[PDB]
């Protein structure tokens, strides 16, 4: 196999990053170091037109947690975007 996600990330232009950087911030509005733990993410949901629970939210974090830290970062989050590039399944 290969890395269709890790590759895209590196192959990102200021045009895209500039967008991702947006959420990253709102996804960590109130963080201590600069990560996510639902507490912050969920905050956006309510605005996104939804509101996931703290027990499930983890999914949005475990979906891109290749460190075992629990929180998402510019490394894990970014990928969280590539995985949801375009819907064509």
């Amino acid at each position: 196999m290969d890395d269709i996600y890790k590759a895209a990330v590196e192959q990102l232009t200021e045009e895209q990053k500039n967008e991702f950087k947006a959420a990253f911030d709102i996804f960590v509005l109130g963080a201590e170091d600069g990560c996510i733990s639902t507490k912050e993410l969920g905050k956006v949901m309510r605005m996104l037109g939804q509101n996931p629970t703290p027990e499930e939210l983890q999914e949005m974090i475990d979906e891109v947690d290749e460190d075992g830290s629990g929180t998402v970062d510019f490394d894990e989050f970014l990928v969280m975007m590539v995985r949801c590039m375009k819907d064509d399944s």
Binding site: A22, A23, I26, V44, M45, L48, R83, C84, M85
Partner: peptide, 17 residues
């Protein structure tokens, strides 16, 4: 949950697409 497309419209609907 939620597609980047949607998270890009709400969270950051401005300066997008």
């Amino acid at each position: 949950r939620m597609s980047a497309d949607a998270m890009l419209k709400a969270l950051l609907g401005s300066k997008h697409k």
